[PDB]
Design a protein around this ligand. Structure first.
Ligand SMILES: [Mg+2]
Ligand SMILES: [Mg+2]
Ligand SMILES: [Mg+2]
Ligand SMILES: [Mg+2]
Ligand SMILES: [Mg+2]
Lengths: 277, 94, 94, 275, 252, 250
DNA sequence: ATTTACTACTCGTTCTGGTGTTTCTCGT
DNA sequence: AAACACCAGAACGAGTAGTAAATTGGGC
């Protein structure tokens, strides 16, 4: 009786765990609190598990998460990803060389980037523009999206501030966007690994160990995830993290993000015209 | 019409029999059925009214990605927990 | 993908934990979830394989007349009966 | 404190057959205790009609519970024929009873209802200026053709319709009589729940279930009867059980319970009088 | 012809209706003198008993004690086709309905109804007399009356008992409880029509008697009293011929 | 370098990496000078420890005992863009692929491969050499060899070898799925490196155990491999070997 | 240090047979 | 005659330290 992972589209989006030790009481994921309450967690029915500060994971627990193919993410403030673990063996050889070959050749790389551009904005990019130039186009379009979303919900907008120091305490808007995109990067990384590709090999983003995660996520981030973050910031709640967590998943549910994630990568890589595996 | 599951403990014989008017009792205190939204709500009204000092949990299928929703009556060793909207269940110690 | 419910009795700890990998254990030995057909069948493989002297009943939602179907493993106080195709459950006297 | 209301009939299981045991109300619910003492809970809810086969003894309280949840109780004979029935004594709608009555009392209006039954059954309008007895005669000739057609289509040895159990190892008539009986079961249960009288008929008259026969005969050959030929084709053991099991699939697939109530009102609508 | 059976099982041991007692004593019942059988609480009917009842055309009615409440009866929707339409014809036609109502009025108060009055007008006279009747009985007993506390609780419990035997009579007679002349639209409209005729003759004054002593559990005390009355006075028995007499005035 | 941790909890008590023993003794661990940390069974890692490990860029790999089994590794799907793409470049191009294979061959048998041979042709030589080696080993440890307690021991032995090999590959920063001799398998590169040092130590130890014919050959081989991997620092000596192989791809 | 196999033992729920009661949960 | 309300005991299963053993379910 071997233990194999279930299809990712058939899973729950994400779970956040904090303040307790993680054990494997008789074959299953358990979270024991400081007061000693036990909480069984269905790791087979969860695409991604987020580990907040205060958690201590046992060796066997990490092992179980890999068998059922569940990505484990240690997160920081506003849900920023710190570390992650998973089945290192998991990856398709035919698909790895496919992604790599598409990335190494500049001509092939450019075709892939244009596909990302087209799928993201809904229109083809101007001809004979380089990656650096599309990146410039990207930024201009993004600033407009921020402004439009601000006007639609009634949010005080001063600009995108990435580091938590630059947040004006009562700002709550940037904390929501950074927390929202973090949730998307979580399930996206889990999707890429399950798809059998490398998260490190990117076309638009390069050099970063999660460049491909950023490439894929950016395409649909403002389509669903980010606008949901503005909804939360409008009401200005006490615990913006939780409401965003709840908000992003509901979006993932209605839009069937997990189901449409796997075909998107292959759709993107197809633009290279190299024979798909 | 969606699937329905009712699990009862320490409830008076009145409620146990009442549930047996519509639902199938596969195990001791475990009822299964397939009812509409209204009938389900009527089932719960029977539960909250006829159960005393007992604890009941009822789960029905919905369109959430978990695929189902559950609500509890009374107090039990196993209490449901809300994890950012996602509801699991914890085990309380002594 | 349809709703799934597994009720176990006298089963070894191996199976109880295994079921807790995919399903939610609302009550002692009562698991609830929403899995596909293919997955439901693999869970049953886990049941028939890890249970031996224990008794399990599993009910899932379908397009049959009851709206659901249930199958049992091992022997129990409550045995299912076939009434002209419609299957209920009887209570055996010691 | 403890109200007990019936659920919509379309949301129920069509039928259940019970035999050889006493029926009690152990703590609020329908139970069947066999001679060996095993208990079998029967949900009287989620069951449009309950068939009581020989060997059953029903308690006063059991009949009471069945009436509250609006479940029709039918005592059946050989091959599932119908003997007796019990249900809410009142449980009838005055507006609907008088509507049906008015349509039956007026000679002109009654004929309009009969012609509508003919049209809905065969899929084509009845010949003009024909009386009830004459339309009844046309009906028979076509049915006889249907029997022959159904027999050849399913490869069943056919010699004719034998109603009495005396006149039939040929399993075909036992299947047809058992099949239509199941249809008469849910039909009577539907009519009562709808608030109409089973006794007031337009095509059928004199019988205590004349209206049941009227409604059931319209859709009888659309689904139920041809399914009986399928069972008889294989010529299996326990013909009764297989037919009942087969009928369940039909009531489900054809959504019979759901379509029964609108059928009555659609038929009576031909009277041209505001329901 | 009718029989009440209580505390026993109904079988057909040796060709005929038998009632097996708790002492195991058999009570043989002939198939002739049983047009209708009233089944009081505590009774268990066998399949064979039901089969025989169907052959000889015997109506089976599940009742409470002394017909205090009806729960279920054999032959649901109707039994006699001709009687359903007979009652219907009398109710649908305004001229025939008016004749039936006048008969109800006359039998109830002991005097002919006023001339040139319609059904709607007759209802107004009835209401005034009923309210007056309640007041008169109130002074006759020692009960404080203000209109329709513990006084109403007794009366409402009484009329429910009365509606029981009335419906049972209607069913035994073969008519529909839903088709009414004075009351209409209600599923028990015909029950109310007949019940009002004999309501103040025995039942209501007994309710005031109970309310006078103001005992524990007034609901229960009234029900048992009604049971005793229905039996000793044979209320159900005298109701059925009364019913057909009422509908008769509608045709001639 | 590298560090092995076993039987204890990993925390950040007050500013430094610590391993808490069953006796409650604290053991300071420098997060500097540790490219990779191998977590043997019985270990519990705290969130703060993982956070610190991420800051200093230390790879976390969950291994079995003495790295015998790989179960999970940090930064899944590689973390180094340049090393994965480097490895990819060597495998996609046929000319570079052959150069890498020749180095594997040379490091394996201790002598350069015959000239003007293709990868497929070199694969035939290897198979011939391996079966011959098995036969020779059979003669040395008086074991009846046909190609059954001996195979059960060998199969158990190579599994142990695949563990430390994969752990080395992960620590080196390369992909286990991209192989030169073996291809298509998700652990193709693991097999490539493991075959090089397979007969140097592990396999002859497997014949030794099967020779004594014990009740639990599986456990004894795994435990023996554990003892070998630790004392000989196989995992430690594997990583420089790996980089030498891809360097040959020039 | 973490996890599992295994067993009475404690705790807790179902089932049950002993008391006794009712024929019952209303209004046109 | 049939059914229900009340309760502590008998039976039975789940939860729980105790003992012990492992660090484990294949090959390329
Ligand atoms: Mg970007
Ligand atoms: Mg739990
Ligand atoms: Mg029972
Ligand atoms: Mg008793
Ligand atoms: Mg222990």
């Amino acid at each position: 009786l071997p233990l194999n992972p279930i299809p990712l589209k058939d899973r729950v989006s994400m779970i956040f765990l904090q303040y307790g030790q993680i054990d494997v009481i008789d074959g299953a994921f358990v979270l024991i609190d400081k007061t000693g309450i036990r909480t069984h967690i269905p790791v087979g029915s969860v695409a991604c598990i987020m580990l907040e500060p205060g958690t201590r994971v046992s060796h066997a627990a990490v092992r179980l998460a890999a068998q059922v193919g569940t990505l484990l993410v240690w997160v920081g403030e506003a849900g920023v990803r710190v570390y992650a673990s998973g089945q290192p063996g998991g990856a398709r050889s035919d698909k790895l060389l496919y992604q790599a070959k598409l990335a190494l050749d500049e001509d092939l790389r450019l075709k892939v980037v244009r596909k990302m551009f087209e799928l993201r904005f809904g229109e083809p990019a101007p001809a004979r523009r380089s990656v650096e130039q599309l990146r410039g186009i990207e930024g201009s379009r993004v600033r407009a999206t921020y402004a439009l979303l601000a006007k639609q919900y009634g949010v005080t907008w001063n600009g995108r501030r990435y580091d938590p120091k630059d947040w004006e305490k009562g700002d709550t808007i940037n904390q929501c966007i950074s927390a929202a995109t973090s949730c998307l990067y979580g399930v996206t990384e889990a999707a890429i690994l399950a798809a059998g590709y490398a998260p490190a090999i990117g076309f638009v983003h390069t050099g970063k160990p999660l460049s491909f995660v950023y490439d894929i996520a950016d395409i649909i981030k403002f389509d669903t995830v980010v606008p949901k973050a503005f909804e939360i910031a409008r009401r200005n709640p006490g615990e913006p993290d939780r409401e965003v967590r709840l908000a992003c998943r509901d979006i993932f549910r209605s839009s069937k993000t997990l189901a449409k994630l796997i075909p998107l990568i292959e759709d993107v890589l197809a633009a290279g015209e190299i024979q798909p595996p | 019409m969606s699937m329905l599951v009712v699990v009862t403990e320490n409830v008076p014989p009145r409620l146990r029999g009442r549930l047996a008017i519509w639902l199938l009792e596969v195990r001791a205190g475990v009822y299964v059925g397939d009812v509409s939204a209204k009938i389900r709500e009527m089932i719960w009204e029977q539960i909250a009214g006829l159960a005393e000092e007992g604890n009941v949990v009822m789960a029905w299928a919905t369109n959430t990605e978990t695929g189902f929703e559950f609500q509890t009556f009374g107090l039990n060793r196993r209490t449901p927990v809300d994890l950012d909207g996602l509801r699991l269940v914890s085990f309380l110690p002594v």
